[PDB]
Amino acid sequence: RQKARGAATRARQKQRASLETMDKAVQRFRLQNPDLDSEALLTLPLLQLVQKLQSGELSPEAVFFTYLGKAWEVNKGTNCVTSYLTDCETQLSQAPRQGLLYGVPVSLKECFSYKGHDSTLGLSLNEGMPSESDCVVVQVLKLQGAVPFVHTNVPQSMFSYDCSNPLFGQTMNPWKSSKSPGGSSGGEGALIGSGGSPLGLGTDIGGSIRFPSAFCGICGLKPTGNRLSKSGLKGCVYGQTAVQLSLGPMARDVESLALCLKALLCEHLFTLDPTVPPLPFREEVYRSSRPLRVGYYETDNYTMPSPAMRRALIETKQRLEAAGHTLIPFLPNNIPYALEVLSTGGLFSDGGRSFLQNFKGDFVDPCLGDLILILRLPSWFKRLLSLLLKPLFPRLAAFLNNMRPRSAEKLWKLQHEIEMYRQSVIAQWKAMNLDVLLTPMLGPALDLNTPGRATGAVSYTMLYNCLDFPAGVVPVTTVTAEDDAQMELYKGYFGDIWDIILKKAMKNSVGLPVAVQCVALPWQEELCLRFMREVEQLMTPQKQ
Amino acid sequence: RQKARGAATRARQKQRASLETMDKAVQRFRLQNPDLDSEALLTLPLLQLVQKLQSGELSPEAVFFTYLGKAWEVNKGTNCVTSYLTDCETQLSQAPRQGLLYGVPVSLKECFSYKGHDSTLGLSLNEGMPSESDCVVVQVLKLQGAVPFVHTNVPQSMFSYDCSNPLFGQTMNPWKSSKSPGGSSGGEGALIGSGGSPLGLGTDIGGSIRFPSAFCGICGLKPTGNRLSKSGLKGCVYGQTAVQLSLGPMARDVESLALCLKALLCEHLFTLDPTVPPLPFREEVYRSSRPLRVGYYETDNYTMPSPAMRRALIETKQRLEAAGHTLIPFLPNNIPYALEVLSTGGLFSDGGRSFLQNFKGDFVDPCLGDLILILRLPSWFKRLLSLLLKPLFPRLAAFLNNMRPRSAEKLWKLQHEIEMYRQSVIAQWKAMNLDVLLTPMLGPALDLNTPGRATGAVSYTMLYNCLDFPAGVVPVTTVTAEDDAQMELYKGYFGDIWDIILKKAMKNSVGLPVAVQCVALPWQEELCLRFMREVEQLMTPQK
Ligand SMILES: *[C@](O)(CCCCCCc1ccccc1)c1nc(-c2ccccn2)co1
Ligand SMILES: *[C@](O)(CCCCCCc1ccccc1)c1nc(-c2ccccn2)co1
Ligand SMILES: [Cl-]
């Protein structure tokens, strides 16, 4: 493990030096600007911040250094920042004045390649391998006048809804030190949730924008996978197209997400990556205030919702009905099949071999639980173990069988099944003439190092990665004493280790945020946001 | 083969009865409408036909029955029509008046599912299996007032640029009976090419819109794969996503292609198939008359062009330069790798096993050559044969090696290579600041039953299926006596069987049409059409 230890030493050194550089830059600004009101600046909603930047009422220098100082401070308690993006003080001076995001500091998940910086993903193999250029979405953010300023932490490999790796260590939830911030966009969730950044970018293949957004009490949107460019993003599995990765914004309110999307969906983006359909942001759809037909479910019958989750969903449904929306019971067909056969099979068609390459010679972070050990099992043993478990723990049996390697022939068969499945859910949707769908969202935040042992709980989010529908989350309530107490009566629908771990993990969560999830059809991000805006307005009206 | 023989008998009976129904309907209309000038109606460009339908100057009944009569007539010499779509006389009466295609008769490749009709693909297994509903693009066509009226022939399985199957037989080029119409959208090419339909829809995975459009002297466009809905289309390989199928229009002129795309890219389409990006047709791009930076190559260094092909490309380049456009030498990198490893590998990742299921218990049409025989070979033998051929016939060796079955792990590796390759060609393109690319297009038409034995010749077209860029073809010239005579001097770059067959196949083509290919970046169909429109105006005025 000599190489891996050396890598961790070098990465920790680089982190420490970055945070020093941040501190020195902040103190310099503060010496030259003693009269600035920082707390007022930091509490302005993004849309107001932008208008003040656009009017010259606030300087971009003031905004950037005030947020830099806040980011450095909140990092002390969260360990969310891995790198200060250095050059950002010269982008600050060169930011296009007419840019939609002029002067706005933006945080980036560590996978958004930035010239001269590693995108380690917590893997020793990627340390000391700095990017030669900014990824396309970074380029566009800069062309729109934004100032990307930090890389934020992720769990090792990014394939996890916790947030620890052997290079930079563990990110903590800003609400409670014992809780996971979620992830794999956890650093973003922790930073934005603490007030350290107004806007961030994450990525999502099974809930990685939505988990941190829910657990840290912020808003996030996972668009249709090819709505935004993935060109130049750092990944760790190559050529897996059955369940595609999506990138999208995270922020403190829904309007911020809409602004971000609007800024990104510009000619710069479409010319820098011709493979993205040139679909501009449709403001009129986003701004619509007509009644909606809203499908909803209280449970997916796969992961029993926590008391807080169930209350969150029911209250939101009640408030929407009171506001004049039509609430229609709706459940996508064959969720177990979709999660166990289509999603798991799509992610692990090769039995994990490609994924496991990344860990050769490296430490495996405890936050990944036993995933690496299981993936390393011979296919025949996965199959045999599957057969033994099936009668008692069919969920566990099904995940094991579907993580086996297979032929290109059988992958084709799976890819066709995914396609047909998507069309089957679209058919149900049209049959009930739905506009949008309201679902529960996992939480309250799980304890540290339990997401990796509660894999079944991805059911609420991973379904919409399999279907490739835009899906976002909005905070709507906080866990009450009653909600938390009632977790003692949680049994789960299967009573397997995943249900047992989740019961324990979600305890001790009084005061923690809880969200719902908002879904629309492919390419309907604007309608998704219109619905998220409605939920936010009804459940948390002062976010506006 | 008892089932297969019975299937061929029942399909031939159905075709015969269809053509009879058409004839009877045509004769009825003519009895009631003796004073109609048909020849003038038939020679109206589509856009004028549409305005007359829209103004009430011509009735949709007159238009439909005149074209039906013409379709029936030209089918005598081409065998392009497999089925009359029967209910179309009721769609004719129900066609929405405000529809962009109101009253326009439309021909459909047989794979476009139509309620109550087989989409056999020339395969016995699909005979007697009528569709329960219209595919989404048929639905949209109808909502825009169009009257789909015939299914047109395809080669067995559709994976071929000839056009014969054991059920309905061989489709012939309307220009010369000994020539292939191209394909796999060959019946469309033959029908539109002879004047029997003003507008048709084809599909394309390796050139299947572009070959028949070139060989029959018409215009066609293969859009970006997911620009139009494939929902409800009949296929024969399921779940192969490395090299995506694309569907698109074929017509007599470029403006017809633009109108079809405009009418298709409507709210009805986007609501019926939510998986398609809701990108409306950008008329301002299509109508743009600014100078273009036009990349071009005269050869892809893989398939030596015929004398007519080369002259077609050079004259088009020269006219474009005369018109003020900047012509910039450009060639996509690593074409052999793209064709041999990415395209062939993508199409046959499983070694052909999924494809071969379709032919179990069936006859194999001669127009498929030895493709089914080679796909049936054991993987180890494909490998050994590959090694033996490599020193003399490296093209043939590479295709063989890359038609072997592999693991999902290796397919992932291939899909990543495809993605990176696309990005490499886009980077070349941006480095030269190209707007569009001009390339040769295969032809003149090959002799019947030779496309199946000249697989290397798909190089010009298949490259942009691999890259998934919009690509269209426009006729620009005809083969001269000199062009044809010089085929004697054709050697090919490889001198393998495919070069030898192609030399023989392209002989005896004096008078036959020859096209060029127009390419743009993904999602830039309107720019592609703007460039096709320029080529057509410069090379063929009156069109
Ligand atoms: C997140 O969406 C990952 C959330 C965790 C979902 C785990 C799903 C699962 C676990 C075990 C068995 C079957 C299913 C995310 N991951 C990425 C990512 C990961 C790796 C490479 C690139 N991106 C991005 O966002
Ligand atoms: C046409 O594009 C097919 C053109 C012929 C290309 C052959 C390429 C090749 C042959 C041998 C080895 C390697 C490459 C077309 N085909 C379809 C189709 C076929 C089967 C199912 C569905 N669609 C559509 O268009
Ligand atoms: Cl797409």
Distance CA A216, CA A203 (A): 16
- DSSP structure class, residue A377: S
- The three-class DSSP label of residue A535 is helix
> How many angstroms separate the Cα of A497 from the Cα of each of A315, A372, B31, B167, B284?
30, 17, 80, 58, 60
Q: Which of B412, B428, B528 to substitute to test the interface with A, most A CBs within 10 Å?
A: B412
Beta bridge partners of B293: B326
Distance CA A250, CA A215 (A): 13
- DSSP structure class, residue B508: S
Specify binding-site residues of B for substrate: 158, 184, 205-208
- The three-class DSSP label of residue B184 is coil
- DSSP structure class, residue B183: S
DSSP secondary structure, A3-38, as one string: HHHHHHHHHHHHHHHHHHHHHHHHHHHHHH-TT--H
Burial of B537 (0-12, 13-18, 19+ CB in 10 A): middle
Beta bridge partners of B109: B152
Q: Which of B411, B415, B416, B421 to substitute to test the interface with A, most A CBs within 10 Å?
A: B411
Does any ligand 1 atom lie closer than 6 A to the CB of residue A459?
no
Among all bound ligands, the one having the nearest atom to the CA of B109 is 2
Distance CA B476, CA B536 (A): 7
Residue B249's φ and ψ, nearest 5 degrees, are -80, 150
The owner of tokens 């215009």 is B219
Token readout for B285 is: 């791009």
Give the helix, strand, coil percentages of chain A, each rounded to 5: 45, 15, 40
> For the CA atoms of chain B, what is the radius of gyration?
22
CA A111 to ligand 1 center in whole angstroms: 13
CB A113 within 8 A of CB A131: yes
Q: Do B412 and A353 touch (CB under 8 A)?
A: no
A405 CB neighbour count, 10 Å cutoff: 17
Residue B440's φ and ψ, nearest 5 degrees, are -65, 160
Token readout for B494 is: 């490889």
CB B326 within 8 A of CB B293: yes
CB A189 within 8 A of CB A212: yes
Residues with CB under 5 A from ligand 3 (ion): A 226; B 226
CB B437 within 8 A of CB B320: no
Continuous segment of H or E residues that includes residue A147: strand A147-152
CB A267 within 8 A of CB A144: no
> Nearest-CA residue of chain A relative to B277?
A523
* Residue (of B217, B244, B215) closest to B229 by Cα position: B244
Q: Do A353 and B238 touch (CB under 8 A)?
A: no
DSSP secondary structure, B302-319, as one string: SSPPPHHHHHHHHHHHHH
CA B354 to ligand 3 center in whole angstroms: 25
Resolution in A: 1.8
Distance CA B114, CA B127 (A): 14
Smallest CA–CA distance, residue A405 to chain B, in Å, is 7
Token readout for A47 is: 């849309």
Q: In what order do the strands lie in the sheet with A105-109?
A: A81-84, A147-152, A105-109, A199-204, A246-251, A219-222, A471-478, A513-519, A436-440, A293-296, A326-329
Q: In what order do the strands lie in the sheet with B246-251?
A: B81-84, B147-152, B105-109, B199-204, B246-251, B219-222, B471-478, B513-519, B436-440, B293-296, B326-329
Distance CA B496, CA A479 (A): 74
Amino acid identity at A461 = T
CA B410 to ligand 1 center in whole angstroms: 21
Token readout for A109 is: 């998940």
By Cβ distance, the residue of A412, A414, A522 closest to B275 is A522
Q: Which residues of A touch B412 (CB under 8 A)?
A: 237-240, 349-350, 354
Method: X-ray
Q: Are strands B293-296 and B326-329 parallel, antiparallel or unpaired?
A: parallel
- Asked about B124 being catalytic, the answer comes back as no
CA A101 to chain centre: 21
* Residue (of A361, A340, A535) closest to A438 by Cα position: A535
* Residue (of A518, A473, A471) closest to A225 by Cα position: A471
A285 CB neighbour count, 10 Å cutoff: 15
CB B194 within 8 A of CB B148: no
Distance CA A172, CA A178 (A): 7
- Write down all domains in chain B, each with its CATH number in brackets: 1-543 (3.90.1300.10)
Residue A363's φ and ψ, nearest 5 degrees, are -75, 150
Burial of B93 (0-12, 13-18, 19+ CB in 10 A): exposed
Amino acid identity at B333 = N
Q: Do B350 and A521 touch (CB under 8 A)?
A: no
Beta bridge partners of B295: B328, B437
